[PDB]
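Researcher: We're reviewing a set of sequences before deciding which ones to prioritize for further study. For each one, I'd like a predicted 3D structure that I can look through quickly. This is Insulin-like growth factor IA. If possible, include the structure in token form so it fits the rest of the review sheet.
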Amino acid sequence: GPETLCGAELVDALQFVCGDRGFYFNKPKAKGIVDECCFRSCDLRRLEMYCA
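Model: Here's the predicted structure for Insulin-like growth factor IA, in token form for your review sheet.
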């Protein structure tokens, strides 16, 4: 669907930013971020807040 690549982008970005630290995840909240950020750009540097 239209947001499938956005879901993949979010999880790939979390993994990239957090690296070997791991990250906090929550399915409904991740869906909320995708809804918010798929069409209109968000700053993936902000994903640092989720790193362990």
